[PDB]
Design a protein around this nucleic acid. Structure first.
Lengths: 83, 129, 185, 83, 149
RNA sequence: GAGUACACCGGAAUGAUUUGGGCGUGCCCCC
RNA sequence: UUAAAGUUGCUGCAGUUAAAAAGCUCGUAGUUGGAUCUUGCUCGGCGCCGGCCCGAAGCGUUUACUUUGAAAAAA
C-alpha cells in the first residue's frame, strides 16, 4: 500500500487465490502452495521449472477444487485442450 | 410480483459473488442495468459482460472477476443534494479512500466522484465497493 | 429514366448507368411481368475495408415484397454484368427526431432509430435470416454485435461477411460480426 | 460446478430443460404432413391437434384430440417438416 | 401465482424467435383473410378462429402473416360483438352458477365461487370502463340474466 | 385433365432431336 | 428533561420456543407498479452593393427532480 510520499509503508502483502481471486488470511491453514513440474520437449524428463498455484480454504471445504486445477492447467498448457 | 429489476439483478449478482461463481444470468433487462454495470466496467470492478437480446426483455450474462465485496441498492430512489452527498457516503461507503456510489444525473448515469466536479446531483441508485 | 426522387434534383451519372443497366437487363430477358412498376430510389458506392468494392441500392418501402420475391436472379445478373463488386438491397426509411421538451403529430415506432437499424440489418442479408443476436461489450466500452445466421444457404454467403460488415459500418457506424451456429439448428 | 460456459452450452441440455428456462425460447412442437389412406390428399396438421381434423373431401378423420400430441390415425405417414 | 387459487402454475405458449412466414405456407393474405371473414360469419370467438386456422390451415401466427391481429380485423369489418368474449364467458359462468344455485340453498362452496366470479367480472368491468371500450354508465346487476347474456 | 403409380404442351439442352411421375423440395410410388 | 436507549428503531428493533401473524378468504380508499422512443415563422444591425448573416414585437406541448440568481428584521 502506497502513501503520498512514495514508500511501501505496508509491512507485507498476502497471497491471492488463483481460482476465485480471493485473499488468504494468516490463520487460514487450509491453503496449498501447489507445485507442478514440466517435462522436456524432446525426452519428457525433469527440467526444474515450477508453476505455483494457490487455493483458498473455502474452495476445498465447499466441495470442488480439482476442476479449478483443470482450468488452471488448461490456461497454463499442461492439460491438453482436447481433454 | 417483480417490482424492481435492478434490485433483483443486483441481489442475484451479489449472491453469485458470495457463492464464488464465474458467470451469471440476469432474467430481465433495462437501460439502467446496462449503465450501472458499465460504470462498474469503467471502474474495473467487473470485466466482460454479455447481453442476450431476443424479441422480448433480454438476458445479461456477466463474466465476473474476484475484485468485488458487495453491491447494494437503495429503494426508494431518494433525493440527493450536493450538500447531502458527503452525508450519504460517510455512513454508506466503508471508507472514503475507495468505494463508489452512483446516482441519476440529468446528464447520464454516473458516480459521485465526477458528480462532485460537475456540480450536479439527482436521485440515487446504489453503491458498490 | 426510371429512378424517381422525393425531392427535385438530377441523379448522378453512376446511378443513371445502373438504371440503364437494369433497363437493358430487363428488356433482354423474359422478366417483364414484374419490372414495370418496380423502381429503385438511389445507389451509393461503398469502399469495403480491403481491395474490393460494394454497392447498395435504395428501395421504396411499399413495393419491398415484389423485390423480396426475386433477389436470387437479379443479384446473379448484376454480378454477371460486373463480377468485381457485390450487390445488396436495402430499404430507405426516414429517422424522425425525438420529441424533446423544446418541441407535430405523434411519432410512430416504425420510423424510430432502433426499428430502422433492425430493418436494415434484417434486409442486409436475405438468403439466411437471423436466428440470434449477441452484443459484445469489450474493454473500451464500445459495443460490437455478433449475429447468428441460419445454417441453410451458407455457401453463397460465406465470402460476403466482410461486405456486410463494411456496409453496416458505413450505414450506421456500429461494428457487426457474422457467424453460423450449427448445434441449435 | 462454480465455473460453467453459459455463452454456448451443449444442445442436449438445451433440449433437456424446459422450453421457457432455455437461453432462448424455442417451442417443442412442429407441423405434421400426413396423407389419408382413403382419399389421397395431403394436408398439414399441428403436433398438438387439440380437436378432430378432417382431410379435404370429408372421407376419414386424421387426428384425435388427446392430452398431449396428436392421435395419428393408422395408415398415415408424416415426415420432418422444417422451414 | 393465480389471482384466487393458491397454486402457482407455469403452462403457457412460447413463440419462436424468427419473425418470418414459413416457405411451405402458400396462403399469402387475401385468401386467409377470406377464411377469417367466413369463420367470423359462422359466429365463433377469435380464439376459436385462431386455433381452427392453426389446426387445419398450417398457419403459424396471424400477426406474423397479416399486419394486425384477429380482433383488429373484426373491428375493421365491424362484425365483432360489442361485448368482449372473455367477459361474455365470465357472465355465462356467473349465470350458470346462479342457475345451479337458486335451488340448492345449503350449498356454500358454490356461493364462494360465485363471490370470486363477481369479483373477477367487477375488476374486468373496471378495466374496460377505464379503457373506454364499454360505456361508463354500464355496470353489472345481479338480476340481469336475460337482459344481458 | 383423376394427381398412389398417368395421357400431354410450350419455353430451354443437344437445320433436326429431346428426357416415368408425386407435392410433403426433399424423400415417396414403378422399373 | 436530554444522551447513554439500536429499550420507539426514518437511518436503525422485533413477531417458531423469551412479550408477539387477525381462523381463513374476497373487497373500496392509501401504498408499489415489467420491457421498449437518439426548434422554426412580422420588425431593422457589426459588415457589403431589391439581396446573405446577426438582434426580434409575438408564439415556440405538461409536472416532480437537480443547478444558478433575487427578495429574504436585529441579537
Amino acid at each position: 500500500m502506497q502513501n503520498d510520499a512514495g514508500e511501501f509503508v505496508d509491512l507485507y502483502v498476502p497471497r491471492k487465490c488463483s481460482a476465485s481471486n480471493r485473499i488468504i488470511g494468516a490463520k487460514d491453514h487450509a491453503s496449498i502452495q501447489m507445485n507442478v513440474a514440466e517435462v522436456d520437449k524432446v525426452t519428457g524428463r525433469f527440467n526444474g521449472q515450477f508453476k505455483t498455484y494457490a487455493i483458498c480454504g473455502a474452495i476445498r471445504r465447499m466441495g470442488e477444487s480439482d476442476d479449478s486445477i483443470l482450468r488452471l492447467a488448461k490456461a497454463d498448457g499442461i492439460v491438453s485442450k482436447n481433454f | 410480483v417483480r417490482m424492481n429489476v435492478l434490485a433483483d439483478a443486483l441481489k442475484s449478482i451479489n449472491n453469485a459473488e458470495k457463492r464464488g461463481k464465474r458467470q451469471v444470468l440476469i432474467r430481465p433487462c433495462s437501460k439502467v442495468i446496462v449503465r450501472f454495470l458499465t460504470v462498474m466496467m469503467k471502474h474495473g470492478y467487473i470485466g466482460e459482460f454479455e447481453i442476450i437480446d431476443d424479441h422480448r426483455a433480454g438476458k445479461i450474462v456477466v463474466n465476473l472477476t474476484g475484485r468485488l465485496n458487495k453491491c447494494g441498492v437503495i429503494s426508494p430512489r431518494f433525493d440527493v443534494q450536493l450538500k447531502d452527498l458527503e452525508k450519504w457516503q460517510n455512513n454508506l461507503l466503508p471508507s472514503r479512500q475507495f468505494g463508489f456510489i452512483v446516482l441519476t444525473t440529468s446528464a447520464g448515469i454516473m458516480d459521485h466522484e465526477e458528480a462532485r466536479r460537475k456540480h450536479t446531483g439527482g436521485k440515487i441508485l446504489g453503491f458498490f465497493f | 429514366a426510371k429512378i424517381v426522387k422525393p425531392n427535385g434534383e438530377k441523379p448522378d451519372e453512376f446511378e443513371s448507368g445502373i438504371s440503364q443497366a437494369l433497363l437493358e437487363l430487363e428488356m433482354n430477358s423474359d422478366l417483364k411481368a414484374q419490372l414495370r412498376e418496380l423502381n429503385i430510389t438511389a445507389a451509393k458506392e461503398i469502399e469495403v475495408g480491403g481491395g474490393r468494392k460494394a454497392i447498395i441500392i435504395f428501395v421504396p418501402v411499399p413495393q419491398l415484397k415484389s423485390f423480396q420475391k426475386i433477389q436470387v436472379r437479379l443479384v446473379r445478373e448484376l454480378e454477371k454484368k460486373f463480377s468485381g463488386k457485390h450487390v445488396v438491397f436495402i430499404a430507405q426509411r426516414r429517422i424522425l427526431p425525438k420529441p424533446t421538451r423544446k418541441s407535430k403529430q405523434k411519432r410512430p415506432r416504425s420510423r424510430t432509430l432502433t426499428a430502422v437499424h433492425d430493418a436494415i440489418l434484417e434486409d442486409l442479408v436475405f438468403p439466411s435470416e437471423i436466428v440470434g443476436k449477441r452484443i459484445r461489450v469489450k474493454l473500451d466500452g464500445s459495443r460490437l454485435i455478433k449475429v447468428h445466421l441460419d445454417k441453410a444457404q451458407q455457401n453463397n454467403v460465406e465470402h460476403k461477411v466482410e461486405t456486410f460488415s463494411g456496409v453496416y459500418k458505413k450505414l450506421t457506424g456500429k461494428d457487426v460480426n457474422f457467424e453460423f451456429p450449427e448445434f441449435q439448428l | 460446478p462454480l465455473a460453467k460456459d453459459l455463452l454456448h452450452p451443449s444442445p442436449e441440455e438445451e433440449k433437456r430443460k424446459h422450453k421457457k428456462k432455455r437461453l432462448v425460447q424455442s417451442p417443442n412442437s412442429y407441423f405434421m404432413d400426413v396423407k389419408c389412406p382413403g382419399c389421397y390428399k395431403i394436408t398439414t396438421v399441428f403436433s398438438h391437434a387439440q380437436t378432430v381434423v378432417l382431410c379435404v373431401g370429408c372421407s376419414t378423420v386424421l387426428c384425435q384430440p388427446t392430452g398431449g400430441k396428436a392421435r395419428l390415425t393408422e395408415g398415415c405417414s408424416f415426415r420432418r417438416k422444417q422451414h | 401465482g393465480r389471482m384466487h387459487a393458491p397454486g402457482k402454475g407455469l403452462s403457457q405458449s412460447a413463440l419462436p424467435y424468427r419473425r418470418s412466414v414459413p416457405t411451405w405456407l402458400k396462403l399469402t393474405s387475401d385468401d386467409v383473410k377470406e377464411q377469417i371473414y367466413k369463420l367470423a360469419k359462422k359466429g365463433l370467438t377469435p380464439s376459436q378462429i385462431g386455433v381452427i386456422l392453426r389446426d387445419s390451415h398450417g398457419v403459424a401466427q396471424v400477426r406474423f402473416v397479416t399486419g394486425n391481429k384477429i380482433l383488429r380485423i373484426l373491428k375493421s369489418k365491424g362484425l365483432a360483438p360489442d361485448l368482449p368474449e372473455d367477459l361474455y364467458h365470465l357472465i355465462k359462468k356467473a349465470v350458470a352458477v346462479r342457475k345451479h344455485l337458486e335451488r340448492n340453498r345449503k350449498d356454500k362452496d358454490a356461493k364462494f365461487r360465485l363471490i370470486l366470479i363477481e369479483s373477477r367480472i367487477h375488476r374486468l368491468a373496471r378495466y374496460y370502463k377505464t379503457k373506454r371500450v364499454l360505456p361508463p354508465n354500464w355496470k353489472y346487476e345481479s338480476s340481469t340474466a336475460s337482459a344481458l347474456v
